């Protein structure tokens, strides 16, 4: 899709909803879920706290604090994955992922907790999958349980080939050899959607990649922070692209989502793959022109030159630009989540078969319509709730007339006029929007 | 997708198959089908003939010649749609579409015939839907019967807003009012995929457009000459774009495929909608730079400026280029059909879940892989069988190791070196690749 202008973003104020800020100054609130108990449950990435919030009173209780979560003030690590077992009434399990120290500096661990209704706390931790890659960037860590009773987990490309990890070789395209799998060496588990058995084991029906079946379900992802099943069992996803080409994807078993060889469509438009890990020396600078213009000494591959297998293009890019685009703000929105709106007895008019995708950099929540079979998007990503806030997550109440959203505590956002501000209107908040 | 180069096309000689010409004296052979009798049945667009060829021996018989088919030597009109009833043994019907004079100068008629096995001919013609638009351009006319036992018919945009019909307002986005529909006025049936009951009536569960349920199933199409169901009931489609953006589409009930406001993706890239029907000066020229560069006096709308409803982007474009592209060849392939490769006991290795798309301009058959659920394409459109031929249609034998292709009688095609030739290697032929 083509980028909206500052003016188009500015006017998306959603005067059809009442806004009520339930909480503010949470410490990097990250994921929120409608709890089995009909309360809002939300995580603090930095602290590892699992908070339960009564939306009417805003009364908060720290249900549990995941011990030894490791978080860097300047990083995106910490407590990430958060889900309840689908049949919680009979399987009182909470699944999380987080950054922890790796004795063998960190690792990511997917762990199950048992919720004790009696003592209102979490206990009996079980590590389902450990030794996963960890870094300060592009951790992703969206964890959901599919209709197939499997854990689907997004694990970002760790920031390789940008900024602090510029010269490290991106592994989004790499997959484990059997020997690595045997040694539980999960270094290739970067830029992937993993599909695991509930016990953490490899599903025998996982796709095969380069002759090996591993936890990998799809590969070629950059920073997939959004993952949501549709009512008909499809898996939708949102992912942050580089200077361009944030994506809405349909996750298909064994698909290759192209990163880093391809950003968005395979169109050679506005992006090229500049591999700094293969650059002539580490003193070379990243011009930050999305590979369209690069400093001498870094090998560049057009998207069309990639010898790819099972490349799956995005359903929608936010956004795609041409090579002439001036990167020197970028034509992206930094989607932070992806939520399948299920409607309900007070379903919002026209919102059938929509995907809600919060934007960090634009301070909007996009509404993306799909056909009733969730096979295609219809039209464009429609901005809502414009404000000087970094929207981090969104859910709806079971009745469907109320949206609960999280905002970041700190960071930059585009103001109505297009300029950047780091003055966020509702820092680290839990906000409810009620359809009028 | 990004255009392949002439050398990339030139090398696509599919050397792993043996080519054999089965028939070489066809006149504008258009559609071919693997028939219920395990014979190949094929149409001749201008003559209206329906031929049946023994796939093994190559013997052929003219089963029928559809009377009064109208065709212009400079046009794409004539005998178009061709399909068998899916349960032919018990329902010996053949459905066609064709250009006929309109006594109310032409119309398109979707017509059923009954096959008589004993005299081996067609009889008892029944007009299922008449008064459909007709013109010399962008007729499309692929007719298939879906798993739902409904006829699906592609009817092109009639060439409006280009060449001889430059100044006629494209109706791809337009839909009938209930009055028009009640009066059997199908002028808006241009640039659509229609879905009709077997008797020609409107399916009660057809989608609604602008508040009306008509035979329209999808709208916003230019020249959709490819239509094929997948084994799991999805409807794949190919469509010719203008100077760019030929498409592979997944046809979804009630979808709007954007033409003419949007070519390919809604990307404002390499195309813009220059509406000549809205140019107050009818002497205005079409610079033919795909709307990117236009003469003064024609309103141009960017793809992103269109107020579209239910816009469905293509699965794949052949091809998409940037605004800097120089249209003075074009980044298209002119897909002439779309065939779902079903494999079989001698299936071609690696061709699972592929869609075969013959190219007129490039003289190749593209193979487009999809995932096993036919939800997404995998990788790119891979060219095969490069030749100086305009490939018109393609099917495979039941076992999967033989491909049967029709080639145009005449026209232009790109040679291995990128230059154009109107010297076709196999004019109006039925060829097989084993
Ligand atoms: Ca980005
Ligand atoms: Ca991608
Ligand atoms: Ca791209
Ligand atoms: Ca064309
Ligand atoms: Ca289209
Ligand atoms: Ca376009
Ligand atoms: Pt809205
Ligand atoms: Pt080949």
Swiss-Prot record, chain A:
Where D-glucose binds, per the record, is at: 76, 137, 162, 222
Superkingdom of source = Bacteria
Enzyme Commission no: 1.1.5.2
Name the positions where Ca(2+) 1 binds. Answer: 241-242
Q: Which InterPro entries match?
A: 6-blade_b-propeller_TolB-like, Glc/Sorbosone_DH, Quinoprot_gluc/sorb_DH_b-prop, SndH-like
Q: Which residues bind Ca(2+) 2?
A: 247, 257
Q: Where is this region: PQQ?
A: 222-223, 390-392
Quote the NCBIfam families the UniProt record gives.
Answer: non_repeat_PQQ
Q: Quaternary state and partners of this protein?
A: Homodimer.
Q: What does this protein do?
A: Oxidizes glucose to gluconolactone.
Q: What else is known?
A: Acinetobacter calcoaceticus contains two different PQQ dependent enzymes with GDH activity. GDH-A prefers 2-deoxyglucose as substrate, the specific substrates for GDH-B are disaccharides.
Name under which the protein is recorded: Quinoprotein glucose dehydrogenase B
